[PDB]
């Protein structure tokens, strides 16, 4: 049972208990507000107390998709985004300036509020701020930040592949390609998010989809299956060996692996212009 | 270089070349066209060739976001959505019903094609496709394929937690805190997501942000820092001290760590009302 604000490319969530001025809860790294809500208790009779989830977080919904470039490290799309989203839930909530506290990530959030809509803030605290960019050694923290998590997100996406690689029973052709890796660290990176997308979005939804062989027989006259000449002993060979016994659909074998349109790319066209020229 | 063609929630891009009766290859695992490019040199003369990046790939682009659902394994949205940006392209390019060709994963989107909207179809080949559903014993593979999926991503997500947690220099009552399980797995997941989308979308972003300390002088009067009891030593204590020294800012104390507004939810009001009440 949460509020909701309807804004620009999202709907914002937040918790509200108590009477008073409002003061506003900014979450951290864990970017949802039920994390304030034992302290909401001990205020909500001097304050009117507002607990956000920020718009990526918890029960908030992004109606529209993040820019490709919120990954980027220098972007600032997200924390603009978020303090124009406080600032217009503080305009919601009262016409006089607001009570506002920020803890860690979202302390930041408040200075960015304070910067850019100064207008919305009664009083301000920033609870442990890790804001770096104006400390003397603004550069060593940033870099090591930068380190920090290229890491983390590395080993994590590292190990996922390598767990991938264990389950792969594949053909040599294709284990051959498969393991050429791309020439930048952004590049291999791609490569693993891609993958992981592809197991948690795709191959389950995919390959247990509603389709039936009485939707081949129906229009068994313009099919064709292909199995590769590189890949025998493959599961998806027994799937077409599978549809043909029960249909009669023919199977048509072409060049190389489950790969096989790149690998062996001109025998492969001999073979699709003789079953279609 | 690639073509586009807009439609419901996705900017669909593609490769064209060639001449003759229009064939759209439809990509598996990797999701992009450009795996057909060396194949549609080799059929050019004969057939215009159209390579598609599918929407969630390459250089296709979503204008609106995922339904959240899409995450779930027996979720439709994903199959149904790119058969019917393939029956979509195939309309726009051609008056005629055209050939189809799709590998993998994207075999089980032609398969689609031809059940929902086969007047496109001309003639259509399937490359080895993985599908089980209408398999003798189709829950085993569907069972096994669930399991696999399951270890990639939360063997992938425990060794990235591992790292991130090997990473942290906290205090010891946060450290416990951080310690406590989560009451489900679903919950356990889902605050490790969260870890993974804070580190690559926030920390840096936030941390490394445009603020400056003459941010801080201009609005001086309203502004508290807050230190916890209980962290001292950490980074954002120093940072806090920083701001304090260059502005004249005062620091507070206040009870419990980095998380000291739930460790300490009576505390923490206490002096949040001595500032503020
Ligand atoms: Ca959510
Ligand atoms: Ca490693
Ligand atoms: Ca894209
Ligand atoms: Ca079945």
């Known amino acids: 049972g949460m509020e909701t604000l309807e804004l620009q490319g999202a709907k914002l969530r937040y918790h509200q208990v108590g009477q008073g001025p ?21 205020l909500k009779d001097h304050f009117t107390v507002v607990a956000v989830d920020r718009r990526d977080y918890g029960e908030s919904e992004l109606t529209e998709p993040l820019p490709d470039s919120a990954s980027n490290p220098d972007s600032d799309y997200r924390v603009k985004r978020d303090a124009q989203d406080i600032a217009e839930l503080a305009k919601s909530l009262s016409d006089e300036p607001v009570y506002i506290l920020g803890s860690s990530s979202g302390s930041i959030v408040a200075m960015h509020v304070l910067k850019d809509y100064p207008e919305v803030v009664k009083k301000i605290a920033f609870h442990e ?6 400390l003397p050694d603004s550069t060593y923290w940033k870099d090591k930040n930068d ?24 053909a040599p052709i294709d284990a051959k390609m498969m393991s050429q890796p791309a020439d930048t660290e952004e590049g291999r990176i791609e490569q693993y998010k891609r993958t992981m997308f592809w ?59 489950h790969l096989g349109y790149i690998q062996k790319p001109e025998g492969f066209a ?5 079953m279609w020229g």
């Open 199 to 257: 197991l948690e979005f795709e191959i389950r939804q995919y390959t247990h989809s509603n389709i039936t062989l009485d939707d081949f027989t129906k229009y068994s006259d313009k099919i064709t299956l292909l199995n590769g000449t590189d890949s025998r002993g493959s599961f998806p060979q027994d799937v077409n060996f599978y549809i043909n016994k029960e249909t009669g659909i023919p199977i048509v074998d072409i060049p190389g692996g």
């Open 22 to 42: 409002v003061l506003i809860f900014i979450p951290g790294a864990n970017g949802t507000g039920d994390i304030f809500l034992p302290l909401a208790e001990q």
């Open 270 to 274: 001999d073979v699709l212009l003789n």
């Open 129 to 134: 701020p890790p804001i770096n960019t104006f």
């Open 147 to 170: 380190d920090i998590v290229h890491q983390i997100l590395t080993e994590g996406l590292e190990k996922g592949m390598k767990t991938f690689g264990e389950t792969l029973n594949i």
